[PDB]
Swiss-Prot record, chains A, B, C:
Residues 130-202 are annotated as: EF-hand-like. Coiled coil: none annotated. 4-O-phospho-L-tyrosine binds at residue 248. This is E3 ubiquitin-protein ligase CBL. Changing residue 36 to A: Abolishes interaction with ZAP70. Ca(2+) binds at residues 183, 185, 187, 189, 194. Residues 203-304 are annotated as: SH2-like. The RING-type zinc finger domain mediates binding to an E2 ubiquitin-conjugating enzyme. The N-terminus is composed of the phosphotyrosine binding (PTB) domain, a short linker region and the RING-type zinc finger. The PTB domain, which is also called TKB (tyrosine kinase binding) domain, is composed of three different subdomains: a four-helix bundle (4H), a calcium-binding EF hand and a divergent SH2 domain. Residues 1-129 are annotated as: 4H.
């Protein structure tokens, strides 16, 4: 149950984040510009927290006591100290493009991206609206509203208990894997924003956890978070095998899928299901002949 | 540390500039003619560079040494390669009006606009006048003359160090955000022309960086660069709500603000602030009951 | 003769694995995140096992009778019950980092890493490929094929038998030292994958058990399994001793050697054998005098 936020706290966050920026400006890093890109994400977060503070000028005790914002600010300071402690321990490994400590910086940078996207979804124009956040899928929005009313945020354990009474979770290992998918901000809470993303991606509600198992646990087509330029470079090694395809999450477009595939004429196209569940777009695209070989493999999962 | 300029250097620039014209002429793009319009900006820039060249016909070693001109030419090459490479990578997504890569072309056209406007400012009718450039606001021109004397262009880190000793900049994050506003040409210097636009927009000088914060960082009414038609179109949705308003910059009129608003009879009028700063104009427009609802929202910032 | 795998032996493994994860999540533990890390390996073994189960949904009678799959699952269940009973008996002592229980936890953590690498080499993307596995060194490949044909896995005693027929094992003590080197998964069987590993490390095949004696049996530079960081932290006491080196196996790179060594400039650097055999590169290196004081000792073994 985290501490009341005040200006000292937000001022100290700005000093931590400044440090992270100075660390990531080292030209030995050769840090790429692609999403997620921590040298944009930090100052965009700073801009949107100034925008929040400005809206609450009269009313800092109402802001500082908001539970979502207290959880968020505690997590922003934690994740900032983690990135600083990662430079300090990783040292010369930080300059090795694909060492462990560098792949960890990419993970953090992702979490900063998710954090900022959640903050803007809860405080659009710097005003709190978590209690009126619009859940996109109607069955998911009934489930939240009944179990949690207008809550913006819930501890993982209550979320998992509430979810289990409607979509049974079959082991503790399944449950930790589910946590790590849904808890994008890695703070052991489930926001209503994070719940909207996950139920959008793994719709329809009625076989939620079965869609999640077969699209994102077991499917050779699944890439988790990638950039469009990283999809093209992966499928390019299969430019010669029409019907090769993968599907990815996008850190600039939370809650949507993008399908990359190799056409008959040796190009690579991308499609965004806007229309159907991914599950159905994969079934249709296999029977239309476009989505045959997931990560270029011969055998395609049966989803029907 | 920029390299010395010759006609060779100009010709290869014109050559790259020429590639981008051909790339932007592609019928498939369906390039809209609204400012900023790269198919006018590139040839107009090509035209001013020739005036300049002609003016410098056999005093050409004194042109090529000018520190402003070396920065310029290096920046125009950088920005033109980046445009060319944008089309390389973007491929089919160039013809998607709202792709990321098409939104990057809009940002680059803006930069080409700002580059042309500065070039003409510093070299009016083709002759170097940067050391006598007239700065618009008196308190700003005295700051520039004290810290920098007659210089035309200064490295961001010296500008930032001098401005901080008069208008203190609270964090690295806040310095980043500032640079993104002042550095129009995205070259990591600050021209006396760039400085004059910033100080005009964010007068008065005595409250500079707090004006910038309350007008352009945190204000829901701020639109950054739009056209007059984009303004109309956006306020069109707020026809039924008199006293709605936004405020915009103009790529064709650097250093000047333009307010759109909804009248009591349901018309959209645009105005262009008279002889008060924006800040006072917003204050007065509220008082008088015109500017009530910034981008149609119920709560207007208190600028008082 | 381990028993058939059914989905009720598999639900039983998931429940033991859960328990291990809850034990090892304990805050007093203060479990470091470095490899092998049991809080990643169990969740990854479960992902990979669920992928296999999904590929065999129509065909469980065919999965559940597979000998390698029956040996693996029997051994996963034993190694997990052993981990739990390590906690049940150790009690408070688990929270002392250098206690014997906590070194046993690290040993079993290694084993879980080896087991997951083996299961992925045998079931790439969840499908059985044991019978067409690719052994790297062709002399090794012929031996396995003459002895065992297309088998994936053989009892230690059969293996020791066929090996000795080609490469006499000189004693029951030596044999048992060989077992600890080869039998990574400590189940008393030798897979095609474990044999591929051993034969890469201790190549060439023509003098195999002599290579092993000289690298692993009689060499004070042999460090066994170790991290990059644990290499730096042991040579750190020879930074004043140009050319102290040790060499080490890596749980994340099975079948590859790594070498650390102190430079003269006094730096600790670490390579990855240069494609020749360790044997060769330890000479060569010696001959270039990089590699001199094996663990700091003034006498170097003589491989030659
Ligand atoms: Ca979370
Ligand atoms: Ca500039
Ligand atoms: Ca074994």
């Amino acid at each position: 149950p985290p501490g009341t936020v005040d200006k000292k706290m937000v001022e100290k966050c700005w000093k931590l984040m400044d440090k992270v920026v100075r660390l990531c400006q080292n030209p030995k890093l050769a840090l790429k510009n692609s999403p997620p890109y921590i040298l944009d994400l930090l100052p965009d977060t700073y801009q949107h927290l100034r925008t929040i503070l400005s809206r609450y000028e009269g009313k800092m005790e109402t802001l500082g006591e908001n539970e979502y914002f207290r959880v968020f600010m505690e997590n922003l300071m934690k994740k900032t100290k983690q990135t600083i402690s990662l430079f300090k321990e990783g040292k010369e490994r930080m300059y090795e493009e694909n060492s462990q400590p560098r792949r960890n910086l990419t993970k953090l940078s992702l979490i900063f991206s998710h954090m900022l996207a959640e903050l803007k979804g809860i405080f659009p124009s710097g005003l709190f609206q978590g209690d009126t956040f619009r859940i996109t899928k109607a069955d998911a929005a009934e489930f939240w509203r009944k179990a949690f009313g207008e809550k913006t945020i819930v501890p993982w354990k209550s979320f998992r208990q509430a979810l289990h009474e409607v979509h049974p979770i079959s082991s503790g290992l399944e449950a930790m894997a589910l946590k790590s998918t849904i808890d994008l901000t890695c703070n052991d809470y489930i926001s209503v924003f994070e719940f909207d993303i996950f139920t959008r991606l793994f719709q329809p509600w009625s076989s939620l956890l079965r869609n999640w198992n077969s699209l994102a646990v077991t499917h050779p087509g699944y890439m988790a978070f990638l950039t469009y330029d990283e999809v093209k470079a992966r499928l390019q090694k299969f430019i010669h095998k029409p019907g090769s395809y993968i599907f990815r999450l996008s850190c600039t477009r939370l809650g949507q899928w993008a399908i990359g595939y190799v056409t008959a004429d040796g190009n690579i196209l991308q499609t965004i299901p806007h229309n159907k569940p991914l599950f159905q777009a994969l079934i249709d695209g296999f029977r239309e002949g476009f989505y045959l070989f997931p990560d270029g493999r011969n055998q395609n999962p049966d989803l029907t």
